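udp-n-acetylglucosamine 1-CARBOXYVINYLTRANSFERASE
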Amino acid sequence: MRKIVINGGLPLQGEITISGAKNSVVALIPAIILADDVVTLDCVPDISDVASLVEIMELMGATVKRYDDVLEIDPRGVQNIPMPYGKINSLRASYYFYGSLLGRFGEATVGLPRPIDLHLKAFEAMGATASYEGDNMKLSAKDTGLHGASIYMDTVSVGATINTMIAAVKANGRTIIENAAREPEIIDVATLLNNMGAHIRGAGTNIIIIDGVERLHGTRHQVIPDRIEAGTYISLAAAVGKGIRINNVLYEHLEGFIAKLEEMGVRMTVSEDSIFVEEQSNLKAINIKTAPYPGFATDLQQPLTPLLLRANGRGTIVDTIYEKRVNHVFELAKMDADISTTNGHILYTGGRDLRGASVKATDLRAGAALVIAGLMAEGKTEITNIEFILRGYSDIIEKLRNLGADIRLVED
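Tokens:
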């Protein structure tokens, strides 16, 4: 079993590039099926989910050219065929094919082995009912096709919002989505569709209005950066770096995260789609309270924690999304960090230097914190159970080594 060995204390310096948003690309790819021509995607992350999606597109009749970070997909040869369960079960959001095939063919036969009910509830309003026979579900629209409807999301859902929006652009009439998700991935998908010739308004707000169109042409879209991976490296560069420029990062997708950094005293210049983090000193301890977008992302409270340990004073970290996301606390405490837990609150007192130890990555974002803390601590830090970290952050070991860090993979 492999592990990450880190000798910290060294100042980091150089350039680093953020990969494409995973949560966005999984919706962009199946949405291409609606197009009548080739659609090109730029800045596509090289992850297992993308590779899996490409195989499915190819199995349904789509030709795909893959090179650099670019995906050229021709959806013209896509056939209306059922999707086998043994090919879609390994997918994150395979339900994004639902709204895709509904707008394209008016039906979708899916294999079965509940947050998916909100998707169906929206499809129901658009005249699409789901039949169940054996181990298969077939979403079938009316003979006239999908039609617009006033949909109020009883629960804020990123998936249900996107899936509804995908099936709405090629429907008949006006579709209004109230209480919709405001996440950046919603805007990214809507941007792709609008550039294909759709009519989407209010993307990014609580009210999205879609005016259906008959045909959709091709276009070229650039996938938005992973805002979480961005905030991870920004927190890293501020903690141990002395001059790191984070490339391919949208400042407008980290409004809440940036505001908290400025409260600490984090100095940084912003130009183009990049952020240059200077060498930090005299940081102030702040309080963190996670919230739905554009609130403080719950997937950023852990990678920010080591930077808070660099700060001076005491603060409090509260996660309203996941009240039990504290599996990083004990591991950081093993590195001589003044961090503890009570109820749901995460107490911390930054200021004192950390010491290298043998820690285990419990989850993805927690392990990212251990890496940052590993670069801070004096001595050697060995992190076990890191297979999901290497998948969460593509080429992370090489990226940090190019920053001047003594990070290394050891297959034990």
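The longest strand covers residues 2-8.
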